[PDB]
Amino acid sequence: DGFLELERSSGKLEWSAILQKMASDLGFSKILFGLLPKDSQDYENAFIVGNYPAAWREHYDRAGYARVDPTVSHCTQSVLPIFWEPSIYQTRKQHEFFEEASAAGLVYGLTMPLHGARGELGALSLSVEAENRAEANRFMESVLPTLWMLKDYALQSGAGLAFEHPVSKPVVLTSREKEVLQWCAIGKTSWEISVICNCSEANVNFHMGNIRRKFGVTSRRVAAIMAVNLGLIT
Amino acid sequence: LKPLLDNLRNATEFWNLVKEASRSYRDALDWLESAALALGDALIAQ
Amino acid sequence: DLKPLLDNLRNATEFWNLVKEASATDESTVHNRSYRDALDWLESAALALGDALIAQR
Numbered sequence A: 001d002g003f004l005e006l007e008r009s010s011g012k013l014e015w016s017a018i019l020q021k022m023a024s025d026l027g028f029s030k031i032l033f034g035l036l037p038k039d040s041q042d043y044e045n046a047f048i049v050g051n052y053p054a055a056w057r058e059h060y061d062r063a064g065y066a067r068v069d070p071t072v073s074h075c076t077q078s079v080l081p082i083f084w085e086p087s088i089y090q091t092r093k094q095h096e097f098f099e100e101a102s103a104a105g106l107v108y109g110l111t112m113p114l115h116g117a118r119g120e121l122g123a124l125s126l127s128v129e130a131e132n133r134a135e136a137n138r139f140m141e142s143v144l145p146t147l148w149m150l151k152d153y154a155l156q157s158g159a160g161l162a163f164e165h166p167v168s169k170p171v172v173l174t175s176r177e178k179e180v181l182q183w184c185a186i187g188k189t190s191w192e193i194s195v196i197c198n199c200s201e202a203n204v205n206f207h208m209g210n211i212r213r214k215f216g217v218t219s220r221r222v223a224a225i226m227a228v229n230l231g232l233i234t
Numbered sequence B: 001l002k003p004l005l006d007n008l009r010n011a012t013e014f015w016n017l018v019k020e021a022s023r024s025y026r027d028a029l030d031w032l033e034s035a036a037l038a039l040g041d042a043l044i045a046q
Numbered sequence C: 001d002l003k004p005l006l007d008n009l010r011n012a013t014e015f016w017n018l019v020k021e022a023s024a025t026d027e028s029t030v031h032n033r034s035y036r037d038a039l040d041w042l043e044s045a046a047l048a049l050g051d052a053l054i055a056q057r
C-alpha cells in the first residue's frame, strides 16, 4: 500500500526523508518523529527527526519544552491522538509554549502517540497549513484513517533504525550535480531541467543516477529532500 | 558477498507492474537504475 | 544457469563510471550521445537480469 518504501531504507535520513515525503503527499507541511528507548523517559537525547524548523527544534530542547508540551505528556499515558486545540494548553507556560509554537508556524495539527512492541515510546506529530481551525479539522478528519495506519508503519520500521548508530560517510556533489538536483527538489521534471542548464535530458537523468547512489537511495524525490535537510542545496 | 538482486527483482516486479495494466514511470525506473548501479558497482570484487 | 548476465551489467556499470569521471572533469569533454548509451545499456542490462530471477520458482 505504498508504505513499504520505509522498511527498504538505507538508514536514518533516507527513512526520515521518505517519512516527510509521504507526510507531504497527504497534505501536511511539517512533521516530527520522536522515539525513545524502552524505559528511558528523559526526553532530551532522544531520536528526533522530521522537518520542523531548525530554529524551533533547537529552542524546544534548550527550553526543555518536553516537560510542558501537552502532546508528549499525553503520549506517556494514552495511545489515541491528541489534536492541537487551545483546550490542551491550560497552564501559564503552556500558553507561552503555544504562542511560541505558532510563531514557528505550528498552529494546527495533531500528535499520534507511539508505543513499540519492545517498549519504545515516541510521538508522530503532523502540522497542517490552513486559513482557520474549521478548515484544518475538516482536512484532518479527511485523512485520519490513513494517518492512523501511517503512525504504526512509521514506528515498526522506525524502531529498527532509530537506535542504530552506523555513521554514514559524508556526501559531496559536483558543481553541476547540486544545481540539477536543486531544480529537481522544487518539482521540476527532468525534461524541464534539460532546457534550463542547456544540456540533454539524458544528461540530467545520468546525473541524478549518480546523485541517488551518492546518497544510497532509490528515488530522486527522496534524495532531493535529504539535500535540503543537510543544507547542501538551497 | 551479498545478494542484491532483491532490489532489482523488486524494482523490476514494479517496473513490470507500472505498465502491467497497459504516472509513476520515472519513479519505477529510478529505482531500477540505482538498484542496478548498486549491484553493478559491487560486482567489481577483487 | 545464467552467470554471464551479470558482467553484462557490470560492464554497463563500468561504462557508466567512465562517462561519470569523464563528465566530472567537464561535460564539454564527453559526446552528449554517450549519456543516453550509458542509460539504455544499464536499463536493458538490468531488465534482462531481473527477469531471470522472477522466473526462479
Ligand SMILES: CCCCCCCCCC(=O)CC(=O)N[C@H]1CCOC1=O
Pocket (backbone or CB within 6 Å): A032, A034, A035, A036, A043, A046, A048, A060, A066, A069, A071, A072, A075, A076, A084, A101, A106, A111, A121, A122, A123, A125
Ligand atoms: C513521547 C516522547 C518522544 C520524545 C520526546 C521529544 C520529542 C519531541 C517532542 C515534540 O516535539 C512534541 C510536539 O510535537 N510538539 C508540537 C506540538 C504543538 O506544538 C509543538 O511544538
